[PDB]
Amino acid sequence: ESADLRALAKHLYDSYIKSFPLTKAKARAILTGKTTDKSPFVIYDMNSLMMGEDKIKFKHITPLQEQSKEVAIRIFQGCQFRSVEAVQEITEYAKSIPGFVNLDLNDQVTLLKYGVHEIIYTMLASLMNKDGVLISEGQGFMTREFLKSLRKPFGDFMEPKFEFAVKFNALELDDSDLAIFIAVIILSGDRPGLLNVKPIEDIQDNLLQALELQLKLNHPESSQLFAKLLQKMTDLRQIVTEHVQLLQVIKKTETDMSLHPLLQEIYKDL
Amino acid sequence: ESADLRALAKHLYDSYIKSFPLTKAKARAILTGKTTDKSPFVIYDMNSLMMGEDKIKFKHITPLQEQSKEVAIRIFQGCQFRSVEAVQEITEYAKSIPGFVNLDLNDQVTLLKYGVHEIIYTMLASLMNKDGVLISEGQGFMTREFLKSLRKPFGDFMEPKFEFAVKFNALELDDSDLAIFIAVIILSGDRPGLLNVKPIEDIQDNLLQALELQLKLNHPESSQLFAKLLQKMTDLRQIVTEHVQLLQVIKKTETDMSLHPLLQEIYKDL
Numbered sequence: 001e002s003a004d005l006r007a008l009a010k011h012l013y014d015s016y017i018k019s020f021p022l023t024k025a026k027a028r029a030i031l032t033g034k035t036t037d038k039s040p041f042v043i044y045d046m047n048s049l050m051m052g053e054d055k056i057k058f059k060h061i062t063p064l065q066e067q068s069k070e071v072a073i074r075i076f077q078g079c080q081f082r083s084v085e086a087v088q089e090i091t092e093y094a095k096s097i098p099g100f101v102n103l104d105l106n107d108q109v110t111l112l113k114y115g116v117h118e119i120i121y122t123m124l125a126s127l128m129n130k131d132g133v134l135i136s137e138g139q140g141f142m143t144r145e146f147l148k149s150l151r152k153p154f155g156d157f158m159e160p161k162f163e164f165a166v167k168f169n170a171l172e173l174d175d176s177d178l179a180i181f182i183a184v185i186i187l188s189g190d191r192p193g194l195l196n197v198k199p200i201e202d203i204q205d206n207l208l209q210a211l212e213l214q215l216k217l218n219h220p221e222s223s224q225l226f227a228k229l230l231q232k233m234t235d236l237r238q239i240v241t242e243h244v245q246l247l248q249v250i251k252k253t254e255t256d257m258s259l260h261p262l263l264q265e266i267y268k269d270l
Numbered sequence: 271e272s273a274d275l276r277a278l279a280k281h282l283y284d285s286y287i288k289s290f291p292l293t294k295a296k297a298r299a300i301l302t303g304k305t306t307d308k309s310p311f312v313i314y315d316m317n318s319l320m321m322g323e324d325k326i327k328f329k330h331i332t333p334l335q336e337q338s339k340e341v342a343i344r345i346f347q348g349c350q351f352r353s354v355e356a357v358q359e360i361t362e363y364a365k366s367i368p369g370f371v372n373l374d375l376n377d378q379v380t381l382l383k384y385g386v387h388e389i390i391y392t393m394l395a396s397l398m399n400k401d402g403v404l405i406s407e408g409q410g411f412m413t414r415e416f417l418k419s420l421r422k423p424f425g426d427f428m429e430p431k432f433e434f435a436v437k438f439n440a441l442e443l444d445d446s447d448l449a450i451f452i453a454v455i456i457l458s459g460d461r462p463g464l465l466n467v468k469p470i471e472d473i474q475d476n477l478l479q480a481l482e483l484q485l486k487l488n489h490p491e492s493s494q495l496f497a498k499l500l501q502k503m504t505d506l507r508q509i510v511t512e513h514v515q516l517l518q519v520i521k522k523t524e525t526d527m528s529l530h531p532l533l534q535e536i537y538k539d540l
């Protein structure tokens with residue numbers, strides 16, 4: 001019954017709204033403008049970064065970075081901080097997915113551990129455009145050029161994410177669409193170490209059925225969007241792989257720096 | 271009109287048969303036996319191998335390999351020759367894909383350059399089962415274990431292809447399905463360096479439409495098979511990468527071993 005599917009899509013869309021502060025609809029409003037109601041502080045260079053805490057609230061540093069916590073290392077940890085935060089928000093969302101809590105406990109933990117990086121980059125696209133990404137609830141905007149101009153190692157971290165986002169965003173999906181896609185990502189029966197794949201693939205198929213009808217009704221003129229969206233999951237696993245090895249190099253040259261137990265434990269070159 | 275899509279499915283299925291001498295239908299008939307006509311000889315060790323160049327035709331060496339062109343390398347040269355052979359067959363098939371020969375000569379070259387190996391591993395699955403792989407037109411069968419017992423580097427070239435084949439074969443696709451799927455693989459507009467992405471994507475969208483109707487008609491009871499097959503496109507990408515780096519190692523350990531020009535050209539670590 002398409003009613004059961006249209007019911008699942010609304011449920012998911014609702015949990016999605018209650019779990020993620022900044023939505024794509026909202027974020028797009030901020031990136032395009034046409035209003036004064038909400039204009040974020042812009043970081044486009046070293047100096048503008050310092051004022052970061054001047055106008056926004058960051059537990060990072062403002063003054064000299066070289067001698068007291070380098071600039072790149074400080075922006076990196078800010079990314080890490082927001083990430084462990086997003087992980088908790090994704091974990092709560094997963095709980096609203098029909099059937100998720102009923103799965104073996106170890107399976108739930110395995111699905112979140114391997115699916116978190118893929119969902120973060122997916123959702124990150126919602127906050128990106130060709131020239132930059134929104135930060136701290138959308139109160140900020142960090143330039144694509146400023147990021148691409150960081151120290152030897154930290155210089156090529158976000159550029160690949162920007163390359164993916166520009167393409168992903170070309171599909172013009174909205175929150176109701178993304179709410180189901182993220183659910184599909186989480187219920188992946190191919191993660192390493194799963195104990196009972198069946199019930200997981202059973203739920204994903206129900207989510208795939210809901211995603212297809214959603215795209216059919218929401219994008220009548222976008223032929224084969226479903227197929228195209230699934231093809232993007234390939235670029236996500238690639239980005240995540242490339243991210244692991246780039247994260248390793250950081251773990252070899254930046255000894256003074258650390259990696260929170262979050263983006264460490266759920267990390268075994270997954 | 272689903273009638274136009276069925277015509278495309280027929281066309282492609284027809285060219286596939288004409289382009290690939292060893293179809294999956296023939297391969298499964300040789301593998302599952304119950305035959306007397308097509309029983310393959312089996313290579314499971316250095317001895318059966320020596321006898322293999324007797325019954326089956328093998329332009330290689332029979333006696334000693336060590337100081338006389340090692341056996342591991344002798345087998346490696348065997349795959350190399352078979353791959354160049356497959357590239358030529360895949361190239362012929364491609365030209366039958368409507369619209370393909372009408373694209374910029376550069377894009378044609380690029381689509382073939384990055385799609386060939388993804389196709390080779392897909393079709394290679396047709397000749398595999400958990401225990402081994404058919405060789406030399408089906409006259410032979412080389413064991414998974416023998417292959418995994420070769421020299422340090424060459425010993426792990428095939429294992430991931432096998433691990434892929436066991437999962438991919440569980441979908442139970444037949445030649446008519448594979449004909450469309452391989453067409454879809456080749457016409458991937460997300461290949462590095464393509465000059466004209468749009469004419470390529472219009473072709474792929476039409477092929478995906480064809481694949482979707484084909485799977486629904488051919489596998490009425492296989493829920494979401496279309497989406498399951500597309501996700502398989504990610505396991506192929508990994509296979510290639512893994513292969514490339516392993517190939518880089520050989521390039522250094524054996525400065526006396528040569529690579530066929532056609533394979534060296536498609537390869538640029540991509």
Ligand SMILES: CCCCCCCN(CCc1ccc(OC(C)(C)C(=O)O)cc1)c1nc2ccccc2o1
Nearest residue numbers: 292345346348349350352353403404405406407408
């Ligand atoms: C219709 C039958 C077609 C042939 C079936 C068997 C194919 N096969 C290994 C498959 C293979 C294909 C490509 C590969 O990637 C290479 C390494 C080529 C690359 O792209 O670098 C790697 C492995 C094989 N191995 C043999 C050794 C000895 C004798 C015969 C053999 O046959």
